[PDB]
Amino acid sequence: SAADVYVPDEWEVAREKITMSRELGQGSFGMVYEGVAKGVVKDEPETRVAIKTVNEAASMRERIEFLNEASVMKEFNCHHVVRLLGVVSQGQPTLVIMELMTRGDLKSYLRSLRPVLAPPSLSKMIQMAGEIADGMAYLNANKFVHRDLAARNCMVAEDFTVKIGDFGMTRDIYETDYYRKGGKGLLPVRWMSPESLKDGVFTTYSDVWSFGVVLWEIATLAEQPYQGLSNEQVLRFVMEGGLLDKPDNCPDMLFELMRMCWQYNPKMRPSFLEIISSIKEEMEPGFREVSFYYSEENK
Secondary structure: OOOOOOOOOOOEOOHHHEEEEEEEEEOOOOEEEEEEEOOOOOOOOOOEEEEEEOOOOOOHHHHHHHHHHHHHOOOOOOOOEOOEEEEEOOOOOOEEEEEOOOOOEHHHHHHOOOOOOOOOOHHHHHHHHHHHHHHHHHHHHOOOOOOOOOHHHEEEOOOOOEEEOOOOOOOHHHHHHOEEHHHOOEEOHHHOOHHHHHHOOOOHHHHHHHHHHHHHHHHOOOOOOOOOOOHHHHHHHHHOOOOOOOOOOOOHHHHHHHHHHOOOOHHHOOOHHHHHHHOOOOOOHHHHHHOOOOOOOOO
16 A cells, blocks of 8 residues: 655645635634635736645644545646645645635535525526536546535535535534444435445446435535435435435426436446536536536547
8 A cells, every 4th residue: 555654746835825814614634724825826926725724633644644635636637626726744734725615515505595586597507517517527537436426515616616625625514414324434325326325336326326416405405315214214215216306396407317317227327428418508608618528638
């Protein structure tokens, strides 16, 4: 296996080029912040950024697995995936400078719409659907599965664009979205595919499955899936072929999309590129300019 060390490369940023403006809420490894960082964007003066830290009471090991996780993202460069701008390995605390997403996670954003004004339009939904499908399609292309795709792990950018959220950001308040299946590890059973539940495997296919539960979230303004059913009852229901009900006033198209995402046989569900294909005529023109879908890279 790989060692528990971190070799500083060209992502290393001089701490003196950073400033903390305020807290945003504790995260997996510690307090996350909002601030500014010089020399992070090319030809750009300053940049508003998110700064993830690691508690002082953390093991060098946890601290090492923090930079390792952030490094996986050193490879990504997709408009619909919250980007890593830099790293600060030298000193204390250990930082990770990310792209700032002023509007937070999609689940919070969505539920905040519950409380003249009308709910999200199909056009706006297709937008989020396509934008999310784009990030996942990009990641899967790079041979990467999410294992935890959900509204809570999607970010809403300043201009409302949705991107695949980076690691260690899930809000502590959604703790309920997890369950210790078989008294073992914490799993997001309400977003998991029938096969992942039964065989413990996660593939590109189980991501499309989750994608579908997310399309559901977007439409039900983020209702807990299988609300009536308890965690243990969900495992039976889903594994036996039970689906989620078409939410009220849910456009035919979206539930139609959902239905396909939930084909019991994983190979029968569409891949992320196909999902985009069936909804590309609904996507805004800019998507043509920033998406991985129309990008060179798609081969």
